[PDB]
Amino acid sequence: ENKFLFLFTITPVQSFINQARKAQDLYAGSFMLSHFSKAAANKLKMEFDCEIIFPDIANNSIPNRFAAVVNVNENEAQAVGDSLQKAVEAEIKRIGDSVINGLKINKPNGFDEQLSSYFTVSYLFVPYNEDDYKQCYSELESLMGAIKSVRAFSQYPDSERGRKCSICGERNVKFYRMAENEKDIERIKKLKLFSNDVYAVKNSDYRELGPRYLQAGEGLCGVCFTKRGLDRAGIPEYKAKFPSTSKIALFDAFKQLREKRGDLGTIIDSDNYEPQGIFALKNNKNLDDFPELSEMEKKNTRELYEAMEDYKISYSPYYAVMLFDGDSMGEWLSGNKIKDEKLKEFHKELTKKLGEFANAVRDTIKEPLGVTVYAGGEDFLGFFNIKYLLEGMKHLRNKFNELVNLPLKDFYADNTYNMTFSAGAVIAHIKTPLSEVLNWARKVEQEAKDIDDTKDAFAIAVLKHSGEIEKTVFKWRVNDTYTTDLMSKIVTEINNDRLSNTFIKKLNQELIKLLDKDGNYRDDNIIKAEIKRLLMRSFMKTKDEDEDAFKKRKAETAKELQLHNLLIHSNGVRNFLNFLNITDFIARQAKG
Amino acid sequence: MKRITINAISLPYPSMIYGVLRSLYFSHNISMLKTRNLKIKGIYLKRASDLLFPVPMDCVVEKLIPLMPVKAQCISNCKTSAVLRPEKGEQIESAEDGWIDKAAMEEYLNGIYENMSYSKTTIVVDIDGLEIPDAASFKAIDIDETSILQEKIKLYIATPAIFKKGWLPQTIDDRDLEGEINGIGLKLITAAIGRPLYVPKPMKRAVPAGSVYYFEIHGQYSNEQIINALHDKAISDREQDRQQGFGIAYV
Amino acid sequence: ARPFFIICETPLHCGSGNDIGNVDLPIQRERHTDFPKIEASSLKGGIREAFEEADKDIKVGSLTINISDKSTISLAFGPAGALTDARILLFPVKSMKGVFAWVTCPQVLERFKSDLNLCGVNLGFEMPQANTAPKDCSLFINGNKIVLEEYTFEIARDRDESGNCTSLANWLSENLFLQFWKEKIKKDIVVISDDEFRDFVTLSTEVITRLFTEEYLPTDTVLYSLALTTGIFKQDSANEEDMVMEFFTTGLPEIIQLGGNATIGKGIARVKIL
Amino acid sequence: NNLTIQKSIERQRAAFAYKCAEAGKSITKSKEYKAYVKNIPMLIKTNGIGATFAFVKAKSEADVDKSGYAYKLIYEQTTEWLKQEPKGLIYEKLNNTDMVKALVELDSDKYRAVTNEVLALFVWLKRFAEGLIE
Ligand SMILES: [Zn+2]
- Judge whether B211 and B126 are in contact, CB under 8 Å: no
- Closest residue of chain A to C25, computed from CA coordinates: A465
Closest partner CB to D116 (pick from C96, C195, C200): C96
All residues of chain C having their beta carbon less than 8 Å from the beta carbon of residue B27 are: 230
Instruction: Using a CB–CB cutoff of 8 Å, tell me whether A329 touches chain B.
Output: no
Q: Which residues of A are annotated as a binding site for Zn(2+)?
A: 165, 168, 221, 224
Q: Is there a contact between A152 and B77 if contact means CB atoms under 8 Å apart? A: no
Quote the DSSP letter at residue A178: E
Reference C266, options C208, C180, C203; nearest CA is C208
Distance CA D70, CA D75 (A): 9
Q: Which residues of A are annotated as a binding site?
A: 165, 168, 221, 224
- Closest residue of chain D to C95, computed from CA coordinates: D113
Determine the longest span between alpha carbons in chain A, in angstroms. Answer: 89
Closest partner CB to A462 (pick from C17, C20, C203): C20
Separation of A169 CA from ligand 1 center, angstroms?
Answer: 6
Residues linked to residue B197 through DSSP beta bridges, in sequence order: B206
Instruction: Using a CB–CB cutoff of 8 Å, tell me whether B80 touches chain A.
Output: yes
**By three-state DSSP, how is residue A338 classified?**
strand
Q: Give the number of other CB atoms < 10 A from CB of residue A283.
A: 7
- Closest residue of chain B to A155, computed from CA coordinates: B166
Bond into A368 cis (ω within 30): yes
Distance CA A556, CA A542 (A): 15
- Judge whether A541 and A550 are in contact, CB under 8 Å: yes
Distance CA A153, CA B78 (A): 12
Closest partner CB to A529 (pick from D1, D7, D131): D131
Reference B77, options A366, A148, A205; nearest CA is A148
Residues linked to residue B178 through DSSP beta bridges, in sequence order: B173, B187
- To 10 degrees, what angle do helices D108-132 and D10-26 make? 60
User: Which one of A386, A505, A582, A583 would you mutate to disrupt binding with C, by most C Cβ within 10 Å of its Cβ?
Assistant: A505
Separation of A187 CA from ligand 1 center, angstroms?
Answer: 23
Q: Which long-range contacts (CB under 8 A, 24 or more apart) does C122-130 make?
A: C123/C168, C123/C171, C125/C164, C125/C167, C125/C168, C125/C171, C126/C164, C127/C164, C127/C168, C128/C163, C128/C164, C128/C165, C128/C168, C128/C191, C129/C164, C129/C191, C130/C105, C130/C106, C130/C191, C130/C192, C130/C193, C130/C194
- Closest residue of chain A to B201, computed from CA coordinates: A161
Contacting partners of chain B (3+ CB pairs under 8 A): A, C
Query: Amino acid identity, residue A238?
Result: Y
Separation of A191 CA from ligand 1 center, angstroms?
Answer: 20
Reference A474, options A464, A463, A460; nearest CA is A460
- Closest residue of chain C to D119, computed from CA coordinates: C150
Instruction: Using a CB–CB cutoff of 8 Å, tell me whether D124 touches chain A.
Output: no
Q: Tell me how far CA of residue C33 lies from CA of C27, C38, C64, in angstroms.
A: 14, 14, 46
Q: Judge B/A contact: 3 or more CB pairs < 8 A.
A: yes
Instruction: Using a CB–CB cutoff of 8 Å, tell me whether C96 touches chain D.
Output: yes
Distance CA C180, CA A129 (A): 94
Q: Judge D/A contact: 3 or more CB pairs < 8 A.
A: yes
What's the length of chain C?
A: 274
Q: Give the number of other CB atoms < 10 A from CB of residue A295.
A: 9
Interface of C with B in 182-241 (CB under 8 A): 230
Distance CA B78, CA A163 (A): 35
What's the length of chain A?
A: 592
What residue spans of A66-114 are helical by DSSP H?
74-102
Distance CA A31, CA A518 (A): 44
**By three-state DSSP, how is residue A343 classified?**
helix
Q: Is there a contact between C230 and B137 if contact means CB atoms under 8 Å apart? A: no
Q: Judge B/D contact: 3 or more CB pairs < 8 A.
A: no
> How buried is residue A357: exposed, middle or buried, by Cβ count under 10 Å (0-12/13-18/19+)?
buried
| Exposure on the CB side of residue A554, measured as CA atoms within 13 A | 19
Q: Kind and range of the H or E element at C183?
A: helix C180-185
Distance CA C43, CA D78 (A): 52
Q: Is there a contact between A171 and B190 if contact means CB atoms under 8 Å apart? A: no
Distance CA A586, CA A584 (A): 5
What's the length of chain B?
A: 251
**By three-state DSSP, how is residue A14 classified?**
helix
Q: How far is CA A443 from the centre of its chain?
A: 13
Closest partner CB to C150 (pick from D1, D4, D120): D120
- Closest residue of chain D to C146, computed from CA coordinates: D113
Contact residues for B111 (Cβ-Cβ < 8 A; gap 6+) = none
Radius of gyration of chain C (CA): 20
Distance CA A60, CA A62 (A): 6
Distance CA D14, CA D18 (A): 6
Reference B187, options B224, B235, B219; nearest CA is B219
Q: Is there a contact between C118 and B27 if contact means CB atoms under 8 Å apart? A: no
All residues of chain C having their beta carbon less than 8 Å from the beta carbon of residue B29 are: none
Q: What protein residues have CB closer than 5 angstroms to ion ligand 1?
A: A 165, 167-168, 221, 224
Reference A64, options A115, A27, A122, A13; nearest CA is A13
Contact residues for A571 (Cβ-Cβ < 8 A; gap 6+) = A451, A473
What residue spans of chain B are helical by DSSP H?
14-27, 105-110, 223-229, 239-244
All residues of chain D having their beta carbon less than 8 Å from the beta carbon of residue C199 are: 4, 6-7
